[PDB]
Write a protein that binds this ligand. Sequence first.
Ligand SMILES: Nc1nc2c(ncn2[C@H]2C[C@H](O)[C@@H](COP(=O)(O)OP(=O)(O)OP(=O)(O)O)O2)c(=O)[nH]1
Ligand SMILES: [Mn+2]
Ligand SMILES: [Mn+2]
Length: 425
Amino acid sequence: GPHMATGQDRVVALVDMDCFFVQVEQRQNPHLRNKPCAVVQYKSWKGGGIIAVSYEARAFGVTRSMWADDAKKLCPDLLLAQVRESRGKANLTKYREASVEVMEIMSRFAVIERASIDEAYVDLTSAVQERLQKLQGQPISADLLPSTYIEGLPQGQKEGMRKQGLFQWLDSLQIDNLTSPDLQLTVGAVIVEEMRAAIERETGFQCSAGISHNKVLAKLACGLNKPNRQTLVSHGSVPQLFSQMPIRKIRSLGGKLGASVIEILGIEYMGELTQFTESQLQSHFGEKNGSWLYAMCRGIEHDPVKPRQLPKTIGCSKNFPGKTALATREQVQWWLLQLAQELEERLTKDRNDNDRVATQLVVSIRVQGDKRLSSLRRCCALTRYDAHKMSHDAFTVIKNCNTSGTEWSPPLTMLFLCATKFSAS
DNA sequence: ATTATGACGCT
Ligand SMILES: Nc1nc2c(ncn2[C@H]2C[C@H](O)[C@@H](COP(=O)(O)OP(=O)(O)OP(=O)(O)O)O2)c(=O)[nH]1
Ligand SMILES: [Mn+2]
Ligand SMILES: [Mn+2]
């Protein structure tokens, strides 16, 4: 009863840019705005691989990781923007720079954890406390939440439903208790409306967000109402929400572990997990995963929002699938050089912008017919930002994979250079 | 012949 902590200490938001690469291209080219459109990489093989889809195109069934020529069969009016190509590979620079615009706006409100190029977590606990004090008892007006959904409401036209749910929530609110978790979530959501308005004002980009008490719930909430909307998942909404929530929808359970939870326990939904003791879960899935599952199915997670706006590693990758796999020494060298040249550019810009130097180079390769995604990974020292030296060292470090008697065998289907181990500069 | 990344756990 009084001693079961309920994981309501924090207010955490997950902000995700709606179809981010597509919006970047639509800002740059107005002819694409408010249309079925997608962003592709390469163009020769089946029109190119789609990596981002507007919501208009999604309504036709167009999805990420689909060939453009097939997408065109579903959506013949589909419009396509192409990723920039430099040194024979995809160059994502435009999107990393748009991402930094967004992150820098978010950082004005609260400390953020860059979780990917287009999404960040936000620790709003301090911001909510400050804002609650600033209100000094004033009740929260629906006008302050024009795009917020309250999950699980209403109980007992889409915008009409949204407003009814919000009204039920706000009418039920106890504004005089500065320590009510539900009030804290609500003020968090007001702040998130303000953040999303500033992002759209200053970049043109729209986003969705989730507001809850931890990262996993915030992330799950963000996806409930997209695009251009935000969702508040309260502690109290967890039993009903989780009672039909497939386990695979929870962050980190979408893969093998989630499938084994399903297979070993004989269950389907997150909420069914409540019926197992902590020890049972640890027995099946190990101590860490067991404790984490026991708390997560009750809506409780303690992973902190890390104060980290910048990526921890800077990486350059290219697949050489099918018959394009690299089969000679000259080929492996020339592509290591192309990769090292993009890496040098990104690293020099990173050192100037962010006052830090990488110190370790990681080289990863895949060989043709190898089951694994990394056939090998080896590290060496990264001492100067010189593409010729980094490519020479990556070769020096992988070359004993060749089994030829100037040829290269097994042919290489992936090269990957990653600068890691940053130190302040 | 989804690709290009990037965080993090295990041992
Ligand atoms: N190169 C590459 N980029 C990807 C890949 N997956 C996603 N991206 C890019 C394009 C996306 O806009 C962005 C973030 O991906 P998300 O999963 O958040 O989807 P997206 O933002 O496109 O749409 P949504 O958030 O659902 O509105 O990162 C990928 O596999 N390869
Ligand atoms: Mn997104
Ligand atoms: Mn995202």
